[PDB]
């Protein structure tokens, strides 16, 4: 498998899509956790190395393994210069 920390520079859009949470279904993948369902090709996420499939373990150091969808969204939009995402791949 693999684990990677991705640093995304940042207000405007991330160019990713998430599914999952402790409260919703990961319809594309009953796997628990928040998952990147989609990556805008040539978007911020895409370029920065993010990949469809990646499970989001943590946003700017906040454990979101067990996060709800809304909590993961909240954390992904908190204002910041550097958005740091720890993900698992494969």
């Amino acid at each position: 498998g693999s684990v990677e920390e991705i640093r995304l520079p940042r207000g405007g859009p991330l160019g990713l899509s998430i599914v999952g949470g402790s409260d919703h279904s990961s319809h594309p993948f009953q796997e628990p956790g928040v998952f990147i369902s989609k990556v805008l090709p040539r978007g911020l996420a895409a370029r920065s190395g993010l990949r469809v499939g990646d499970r989001i373990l943590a946003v700017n150091g906040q454990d979101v393994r067990d996060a709800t969808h809304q909590e993961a969204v909240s954390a992904l939009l908190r204002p910041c210069l550097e958005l740091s995402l720890l993900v698992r791949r494969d």
Binding site: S17, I18, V19, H24, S25, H27, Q30, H69, L76
Partner: peptide
């Protein structure tokens, strides 16, 4: 469950 995708 309910699927739910958020584009960001």
């Amino acid at each position: 469950r309910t699927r739910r995708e958020t584009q960001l």
